[PDB]
Amino acid sequence: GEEEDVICDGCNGPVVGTRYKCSVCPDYDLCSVCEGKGLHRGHTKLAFP
Ligand SMILES: [Zn+2]
Ligand SMILES: [Zn+2]
């Protein structure tokens, strides 16, 4: 079956736990850690699991 895998754009690893998706860029996501490192600063992001 089709499964949409969420891969972190900061570490290239699959996002588990909390997903920080950019509201500006189409289809851009960070894991909780890369988000903690403050990557992709200038864009607003949605925070949800
Ligand atoms: Zn990451
Ligand atoms: Zn962005």
Curated annotation (Swiss-Prot):
Subcellular location: Cytoplasmic vesicle, Autophagosome; Preautophagosomal structure; Cytoplasm, Cytosol; Nucleus, PML body
Chain residues that bind Zn(2+) 1: C8, C11, C31, C34
List of residues binding Zn(2+) 2: C22, C25, H40, H43
PTM annotation (Phosphotyrosine): residues: Y28
Post-translational modification: Ubiquitination by UBE2D2 and UBE2D3 increases its ability to bind polyubiquitin chains by destabilizing the UBA dimer interface. Deubiquitination by USP15 releases target vesicles for fast transport into the cell periphery.
Tissue: Ubiquitously expressed.
Zn-finger segments (ZZ-type): 6-49
Induction conditions: By proteasomal inhibitor PSI and prostaglandin J2 (PGJ2) (at protein level). By phorbol 12-myristate 13-acetate (PMA). Expression is directly activated by NFE2L2/NRF2; creating a positive feedback loop.
Protein origin, superkingdom: Eukaryota
Quaternary organization: Homooligomer or heterooligomer; may form homotypic arrays. Dimerization interferes with ubiquitin binding. Component of a ternary complex with PAWR and PRKCZ. Forms a complex with JUB/Ajuba, PRKCZ and TRAF6. Identified in a complex with TRAF6 and CYLD. Identified in a heterotrimeric complex with ubiquitin and ZFAND5, where ZFAND5 and SQSTM1 both interact with the same ubiquitin molecule.
Main function: Molecular adapter required for selective macroautophagy (aggrephagy) by acting as a bridge between polyubiquitinated proteins and autophagosomes. Promotes the recruitment of ubiquitinated cargo proteins to autophagosomes via multiple domains that bridge proteins and organelles in different steps. SQSTM1 first mediates the assembly and removal of ubiquitinated proteins by undergoing liquid-liquid phase separation upon binding to ubiquitinated proteins via its UBA domain, leading to the formation of insoluble cytoplasmic inclusions, known as p62 bodies.
Disease cited in the entry: Paget disease of bone 3: A disorder of bone remodeling characterized by increased bone turnover affecting one or more sites throughout the skeleton, primarily the axial skeleton. Osteoclastic overactivity followed by compensatory osteoblastic activity leads to a structurally disorganized mosaic of bone (woven bone), which is mechanically weaker, larger, less compact, more vascular, and more susceptible to fracture than normal adult lamellar bone.
Domain comment in the entry: The UBA domain binds specifically 'Lys-63'-linked polyubiquitin chains of polyubiquitinated substrates. Mediates the interaction with TRIM55. Both the UBA and PB1 domains are necessary and sufficient for the localization into the ubiquitin-containing inclusion bodies. The PB1 domain mediates homooligomerization and interactions with FHOD3, MAP2K5, NBR1, PRKCI, PRKCZ and WDR81. Both the PB1 and UBA domains are necessary and sufficient for the localization into the ubiquitin-containing inclusion bodies.
Protein name in the entry: Sequestosome-1
Residues of the full protein shown: 126 to 169 of 440
